[PDB]
Design an enzyme around this catalytic site. Structure first.
Site, PDB file in Angstrom:
ATOM      1  N   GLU A   1       1.031  21.825  -3.971  1.00 13.20           N
ATOM      2  CA  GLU A   1       1.884  20.843  -3.319  1.00 13.20           C
ATOM      3  C   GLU A   1       2.045  21.199  -1.853  1.00 13.20           C
ATOM      4  OE1 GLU A   1       3.180  18.147  -4.902  1.00 13.20           O
ATOM      5  OE2 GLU A   1       3.168  18.663  -7.031  1.00 13.20           O
TER       6      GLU A   1
ATOM      7  N   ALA B   1      -1.497   3.523   7.968  1.00 13.89           N
ATOM      8  CA  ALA B   1      -0.626   2.372   7.742  1.00 13.89           C
ATOM      9  C   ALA B   1       0.086   2.444   6.394  1.00 13.89           C
ATOM     10  CB  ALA B   1      -1.400   1.065   7.852  1.00 13.89           C
ATOM     11  N   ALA B   2      -0.633   2.903   5.380  1.00 12.86           N
ATOM     12  CA  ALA B   2      -0.087   3.013   4.025  1.00 12.86           C
ATOM     13  C   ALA B   2       1.114   3.963   3.893  1.00 12.86           C
ATOM     14  CB  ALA B   2      -1.183   3.434   3.061  1.00 12.86           C
TER      15      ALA B   2
ATOM     16  N   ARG C   1      -1.595  10.377  -5.443  1.00  7.82           N
ATOM     17  CA  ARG C   1      -2.672  11.120  -6.075  1.00  7.82           C
ATOM     18  C   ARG C   1      -2.848  10.642  -7.513  1.00  7.82           C
ATOM     19  NH1 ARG C   1       1.124  16.437  -6.845  1.00  7.82           N
ATOM     20  NH2 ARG C   1       1.205  16.354  -9.144  1.00  7.82           N
TER      21      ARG C   1
ATOM     22  N   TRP D   1       0.831  -1.191   0.000  1.00 11.17           N
ATOM     23  CA  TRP D   1       0.000   0.000   0.000  1.00 11.17           C
ATOM     24  C   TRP D   1       0.876   1.255   0.000  1.00 11.17           C
ATOM     25  CZ3 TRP D   1      -3.942  -1.094   4.545  1.00 11.17           C
ATOM     26  CH2 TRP D   1      -4.726  -2.191   4.190  1.00 11.17           C
TER      27      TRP D   1
ATOM     28  N   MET E   1       3.470   4.341   6.322  1.00 10.28           N
ATOM     29  CA  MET E   1       4.500   3.966   7.264  1.00 10.28           C
ATOM     30  C   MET E   1       5.779   3.525   6.572  1.00 10.28           C
ATOM     31  SD  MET E   1       2.346   2.138  10.231  1.00 10.28           S
ATOM     32  CE  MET E   1       3.625   2.343  11.474  1.00 10.28           C
TER      33      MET E   1
ATOM     34  N   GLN F   1      10.700   3.690  -5.187  1.00  8.98           N
ATOM     35  CA  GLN F   1       9.775   3.381  -4.097  1.00  8.98           C
ATOM     36  C   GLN F   1       9.085   2.043  -4.326  1.00  8.98           C
ATOM     37  OE1 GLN F   1       7.657   7.046  -3.975  1.00  8.98           O
ATOM     38  NE2 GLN F   1       9.431   7.992  -2.946  1.00  8.98           N
ATOM     39  N   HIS F   2       8.399   1.556  -3.307  1.00 13.42           N
ATOM     40  CA  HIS F   2       7.888   0.201  -3.352  1.00 13.42           C
ATOM     41  C   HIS F   2       6.935  -0.076  -4.511  1.00 13.42           C
ATOM     42  CE1 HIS F   2       9.136  -0.402   1.102  1.00 13.42           C
ATOM     43  NE2 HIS F   2      10.156  -0.257   0.277  1.00 13.42           N
TER      44      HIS F   2
ATOM     45  N   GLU G   1       1.974  -3.264   4.253  1.00 16.50           N
ATOM     46  CA  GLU G   1       1.419  -2.198   5.097  1.00 16.50           C
ATOM     47  C   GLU G   1       0.154  -2.654   5.846  1.00 16.50           C
ATOM     48  OE1 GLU G   1       2.847  -1.627   2.086  1.00 16.50           O
ATOM     49  OE2 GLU G   1       4.407  -0.324   2.936  1.00 16.50           O
TER      50      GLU G   1
HETATM   51 MG   LIG Z   1       5.947  -0.313   1.574  1.00 10.21          MG
END
Ligand SMILES: [Mg+2]
Ligand SMILES: [Mg+2]
Lengths: 495, 499
Positions: free
Chosen positions: B283, B223-224, B175, B171, B226, B192-193, B234
């Site tokens: 932003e 949680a998303a 946008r 997660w 973190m 990034q993941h 997540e």
């Molecule tokens: Mg992650």
């Protein structure tokens, strides 16, 4: 009622009660630390001003009013208590007060109205009858050098020939039953007059007005030339003269409506150790300093007298709200009189009068054909060179897309505009105000080192350009829609 | 029972909304409003006045029953409850402030995850549009700021993707701009993941299966964002956060698991080869720059929603909005972990919302500072290196070092320290060689080409504090009166007459 509050401390206090800006404290409090502690918290929580009715072991009937120009938590009315000092209504903000002050400073004074009698004479103690320790004189902070009788009021002196009556703001530490001690700056008007008495071989006759008419306290701090009496500028501030009675023992004139008047003389050479004490910069430095004795020959007061108190320290308190605002108003005069493209100046209360924010008219900036370094220098010379600007060590220059009177917006500009390599302009040749608390031993020996201009004007702004639009309600939507949203705010369901 | 409701608010967006109304933190707007600019403008003003969150019920030309919630983690004007709306995203009560939230987040990062609870059905499935039935434009999709390059469907939710072997469910907050009836575009950063997973599907010659959760459980959204290691899901951290697992259901078209309570779920895939111009957009730094960027297409194959679906929105820009209140706060908490794990004498870190996450205030334990036998220049450089070198600290260009007599979570006190302590000749420590975060708005062309130039440590520790001394006491309620008397004043406050 609002203009009446300005000319009469007792009415000012009733008015506060009526508008919900006063808490009557009927439970018993100690003038030793507790009153100050409460009053300090009041400033910081922006609570209603407290009126203490029951003070342990003090003159029966005597009362204390904490935080006479503290701010209120309700943001729409936050400056109302301050505003009354100038005869201004509840919703008056920094810009309204500044405009009023600037106008007052251009207005004509009005001769004080002399009266045969007035409420301040309702009670009179003479010579041996004088005992200051009977009043609820507070110990204000734990580590203060003594109790303070006068922390919200002014000194009255006069030239020997009577031609010039001088009011100035001051503070007095309690020394004993009929003696106080507090600063007199030789180059200030009070010191100049004290010199005139000294060359005659005489101490200086004196009085101090406590719980004075709010506008008379304002007037006492107005920037006036040598020889010009402050009393007349009450009329300049509120369009109506102050009413004055003669003192009981030394021929001076004090406002008729004052709560408590101390009468006596400033000693030629006797002194006591005064301080340590909280000051405007938010700090209590630990060393005491010898200051002249003020001998009290007589005091007069209203029935059920109210001793107002200030608990100087971290903002916002009266140093910031009254004297900071006045400085802001003077700096705007200085800037505009110099032809600078500045539409507002604000000495943020949050910065304890250690900085001034100059709102720059970006629509006129390109015409100067300048850049950050030259503009900083020009503004430094002009502002620091002035009497008011002497007092403020740091200037922040920022475009008027933000409201410089709102600290959150200043912070936003500061964080997002000031480039660490290019926008930090130190001016170490420029003489400092010596009370600036971060000064070091070298600055103090040199006499300069503390001055700074922080630029928040992006380089493109000097050509009339701007890299990005501000994404705020004010700047991210067309005029029509902003108006619609404001006019329909209630319809939407907001209070 | 307020605490019942507090706990449920974290796990159910719809209940969260009801919770706000009952606390008097919602305004039900029945006035007809326009998705075009008006909703954004109202919500923007709401952040700035710190007004109640508006739930818009009547939106011109919108799907019947559709609603919009503005300012889902905006602040409240009531100082004692200012952070209540934010706090609910973390399972926390109305009087929780910055410090309480940082403590909960730090404890969450070392708590055990609780695997999601798989359900066969949930309310997100109440309405389902498949294929040719997808029409994103029927929703109340806002044009949020006047100079945005497009309308944004997603400003308050997270992407869901998964590794091809199914071993890692990711997660991440993001946008999405509306492109057409069944197409959106938004960032997918390769390092990034989401971008790493996307590359795994690319290696198989496949687009990446994707869903977006909007109106997700507030603590799901938390949680998303973190900072979890690569390979860690997540979803399990909803459990670490609030002690109970998130509930999930399978999507209608691509095998992903999404929260059962979500208001609106988009399902589809991330295109291998297609881009569109996305942005510009307001932003986190408070600015709208004029030029957008190409971003990958996200094709929507289906979507499902709850009856009377509520689309939450964020109107990014001058603070405090959700970029600051949610993600700034999480950054503060991570910087505190970074500082402490490095043994810096720091008891709090706070990325002041008012500075738009462009600075971090570090609260210094002055007694531990004396033990180090250091000085301003050496301590600045040490903190610079440690903080700017971290993942979280990389994001923040300016650091403020200040003694802990002030509360660094109160901007007024930070401003006071800054004005009264930072010496112009001695306390401005620029670090022009340390790599910048490229979004920092004040960077010049030379900085950008070079990659550095914008880093700064502002020292507010007076020289004597390095020997553990202090030139003068702080003349405040906290520091100018002894403990027992302060306690008396606090305890007797109502007895004095204050209400
Ligand atoms: Mg992650
Ligand atoms: Mg004068």
């Amino acid at each position: 009622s609002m203009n009446r509050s300005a000319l009469d401390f007792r009415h000012f206090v009733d008015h506060l009660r009526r508008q919900g800006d006063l808490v009557d404290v009927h439970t018993e409090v100690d003038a030793n630390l507790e009153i100050g502690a409460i009053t300090r918290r009041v400033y910081e929580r922006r609570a209603p001003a407290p009126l203490f009715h029951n003070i342990r072991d003090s003159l029966p009937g005597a009362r204390v009013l904490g935080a006479p120009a503290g701010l209120r938590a309700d943001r729409a009315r936050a400056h109302s208590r301050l505003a009354l000092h100038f005869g201004l209504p509840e919703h008056s903000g920094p810009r309204d007060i500044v405009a009023m002050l600037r106008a007052a400073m251009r207005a004509e004074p009005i001769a004080p109205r002399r009266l045969e009698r007035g409420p301040v004479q309702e009670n009179v103690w003479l010579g041996e009858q004088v005992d200051l320790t009977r009043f609820p004189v507070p110990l204000l902070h734990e580590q203060d050098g003594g109790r303070y009788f006068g922390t919200y009021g002014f000194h009255v002196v006069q030239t020997p020939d009577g031609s010039w009556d001088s009011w100035s703001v001051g503070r007095l530490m309690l020394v004993d039953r009929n003696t106080l001690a507090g600063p007199t700056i030789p180059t200030q008007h009070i010191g100049i007059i004290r010199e005139q008495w000294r060359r005659l071989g005489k101490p200086t006759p004196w009085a101090m007005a406590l719980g004075a008419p709010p506008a008379a306290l304002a007037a006492a701090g107005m920037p006036l030339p040598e020889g010009v009496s402050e009393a007349g500028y009450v009329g300049a501030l509120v369009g109506e003269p102050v009413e004055v009675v003669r003192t009981q023992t030394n021929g001076l004139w004090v406002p008729a409506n004052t709560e408590i008047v101390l009468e006596g003389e400033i000693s030629l050479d006797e002194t006591a150790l005064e301080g340590p004490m909280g000051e405007y910069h938010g700090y209590s430095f630990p060393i005491g300093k010898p200051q002249p004795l003020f001998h009290v020959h007589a005091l007069s007061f209203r029935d059920q007298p109210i001793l107002p108190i200030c608990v100087a320290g971290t903002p916002p308190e009266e140093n910031h709200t009254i004297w900071g605002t006045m400085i802001s108003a003077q700096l705007l005069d200085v800037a505009q009189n110099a032809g600078l493209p500045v539409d507002m100046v604000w000495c943020s209360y949050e910065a304890a009068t250690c900085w001034a924010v100059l709102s720059i008219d970006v629509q006129r900036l390109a015409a100067l054909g300048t850049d950050a370094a030259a503009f900083a220098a020009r503004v430094a010379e002009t502002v620091f060179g002035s009497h008011a600007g002497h007092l403020v060590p740091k200037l922040i220059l920022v475009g008027n897309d933000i409201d410089v009177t709102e600290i959150d917006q200043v912070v936003w500009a500061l964080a997002t505009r000031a480039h660490p390599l290019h926008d930090h302009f130190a001016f170490p040749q420029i003489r400092d105000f010596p009370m600036v608390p971060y000064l070091d031993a070298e600055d103090k020996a040199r006499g300069s080192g503390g001055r700074l201009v922080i630029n928040c004007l992006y380089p493109e702004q000097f050509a009339g350009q701007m890299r990005a639009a501000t994404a705020s309600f004010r700047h991210a939507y067309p005029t029509a829609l902003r108006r619609r949203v404001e006019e329909r705010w209630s319809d939407y369901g907001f209070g």
